Write a protein that binds this ligand. Structure first.
Ligand SMILES: Cc1nc(=O)c2cc(CN(C)c3ccc(C(=O)N[C@@H](CCC(=O)O)C(=O)O)s3)ccc2[nH]1
Ligand SMILES: Cc1nc(=O)c2cc(CN(C)c3ccc(C(=O)N[C@@H](CCC(=O)O)C(=O)O)s3)ccc2[nH]1
Ligand SMILES: O=c1ccn([C@H]2C[C@H](O)[C@@H](COP(=O)(O)O)O2)c(=O)[nH]1
Ligand SMILES: O=c1ccn([C@H]2C[C@H](O)[C@@H](COP(=O)(O)O)O2)c(=O)[nH]1
Lengths: 286, 279
């Protein structure tokens, strides 16, 4: 049966052959296609792309940071993961008119929404215990008590809070689904940079699904990745063409090294990637 | 023929689907994660292999646009599709003893126009309260079409407990390139036999409406599904439907120049050449 990574690579080829020129904020331009979908089996494999190295450490720490409900980019940065620092910098915050906001304060993004949806956001260091809806926990409780449910959804898109965010969410929502003891996940990603973010994003939700499957006593199933604006930035075309030349190697496995009862208890040390043999990384700027 | 995609999806669920129970005890064949693409360029995707309830599509959309959450209002127009969820029994079953009959809570209309406002009842005044997502979409398409955030979201976790039915159409996104407006819908759960063809037509129509307001040509409608399923008692009738060769899609004519989305009326629309098979 074919390698799941051929779907992602298929999507790249499709955007190069059938994409349309489309401008963006940064003046760079993109080749863009609207509406794509790919399916990655999580059964005895983990979809961490091999044709280009994916920043695993960042995937893991960013997810743990989301789970804590943090929106402090400095916290994530302290762990050697710089992926949200440009958006939290004094410069970028001032350019959105957040002059009085502290450096690193990204607003009411992922962490805040997953745990405190609809609560009144003050600042990144504030107390929010019991405020808003804890979507992550509600998902977990529903999978345990009523797996056939077709409403197991986490949503980070909050129109009321948009004006306050440093970068409005790309993963607008995700849905879970359970059949024959297999947990699957679909992600609606409104906008996807195929060169940089998308492989990282695939790994984030693949990992989330492994985490929740473990908590709930289920086997990981599929991860479905659905895209809105799927695009390649023009200065990424050359490095992506190089990537298309490479034959994928087999996916690695993800081992979880102990029994964890609650999602808040997962630590980075609990996870181990086994057999990840990626080709040498190509720089893709942003 | 774009309808071959929908029919393709039916066949895929029959051949590859899995037996799965649901709220109603009926059981389903189910697949998680599907996507289909329907060209809106000089055609309108109203399915021909089984008749779609056009009048209901149109009136339901106009009702969403007004911001209405009153099932009795929709019902008054001969469209009974939300009546069971607005009935007194059902309302009491969810612990809404003091809510009036027809009041579905903060559903579609409310969210599209007043997202995050404090919902009191269906007849209340909400002028200027919350976020008007529909208008913001329209204003963004006009001023900054390249934007990748043109989104309308009906999924509001804070308001879920108050709704009679949680939304199927969690969100939709718009996209503009070369003067063509496209729409993608994330539908968490889709009954391929009944709702899905109706739902395809609703968002296809929305896209035609907004394209008209913004001066753009309709492009694609992308339909993305979470739990795509057929109920077990629909298998035999759907197999009959798969036998029928689809006929070309009809056209949608808009019969006057309308400047604002709130001004569209049912009389403004005309389906031209719709030749569906007998149900
Ligand atoms: C155009 C663009 N703008 C962004 O702000 C953006 C942000 C993210 C947020 N995010 C989730 C990530 C940002 C950066 C990642 C990353 O993998 N950084 C590695 C670089 C590895 C590489 O160059 O291939 C790193 O920190 O070194 S992952 C992802 C894609 C984006 N793409
Ligand atoms: C199993 C299921 N339960 C529901 O409650 C349900 C509700 C909707 C809400 N909705 C959006 C609609 C409800 C009814 C429609 C309809 O078009 N009825 C037609 C066709 C009748 C038929 O083919 O048997 C009609 O009454 O004329 S459209 C859609 C699918 C559902 N599917
Ligand atoms: O996790 C993420 C975060 C951001 N992006 C991308 C997509 C776009 O290229 C850009 C987002 O900016 P807007 O779409 O909001 O303009 O960064 C991703 O692909 N994945
Ligand atoms: O516009 C709609 C509304 C409802 N349904 C369906 C799918 C399910 O069969 C049922 C909803 O059940 P839940 O997923 O809410 O449990 O009605 C649709 O297909 N389209």
């Amino acid at each position: 049966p074919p390698h799941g990574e051929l779907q992602y690579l298929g999507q790249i080829q499709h955007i190069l052959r059938c994409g349309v020129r489309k401008d963006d904020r940064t003046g760079t331009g993109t080749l863009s296609v609207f509406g794509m979908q790919a399916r990655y089996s999580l059964r005895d494999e983990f979809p961490l792309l091999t044709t280009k190295r994916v920043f695993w450490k960042g995937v893991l720490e960013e997810l743990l940071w989301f789970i804590k409900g943090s929106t402090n980019a400095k916290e994530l940065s302290s762990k050697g993961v710089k992926i949200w620092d440009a958006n939290g910098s004094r410069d970028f915050l001032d350019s959105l008119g957040f002059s009085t906001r502290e450096e690193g304060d990204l607003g009411p993004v992922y962490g805040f929404q997953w745990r405190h949806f609809g609560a009144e956001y003050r600042d990144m260091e504030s107390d929010y215990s019991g405020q808003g809806v804890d979507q992550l926990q509600r998902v977990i409780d529903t999978i345990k008590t009523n797996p056939d449910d077709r409403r197991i959804i986490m949503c980070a898109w909050n129109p009321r809070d948009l004006p306050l965010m440093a970068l409005p969410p790309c993963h607008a929502l995700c849905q879970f689904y359970v059949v024959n003891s297999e947990l699957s996940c679909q992600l609606y990603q409104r906008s996807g940079d195929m060169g940089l973010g998308v492989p990282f994003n695939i790994a984030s939700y693949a990992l989330l699904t492994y985490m929740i499957a473990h908590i709930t006593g289920l086997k990981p199933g599929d991860f479905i990745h659905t895209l809105g604006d799927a695009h390649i930035y023009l200065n990424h075309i050359e490095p992506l063409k190089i990537q298309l030349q490479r034959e994928p190697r087999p996916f690695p496995k993800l081992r979880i090294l102990r029994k964890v009862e609650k999602i808040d208890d997962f630590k980075a040390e609990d996870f181990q990637i086994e057999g990840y043999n990626p080709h040498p990384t190509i720089k893709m700027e942003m």
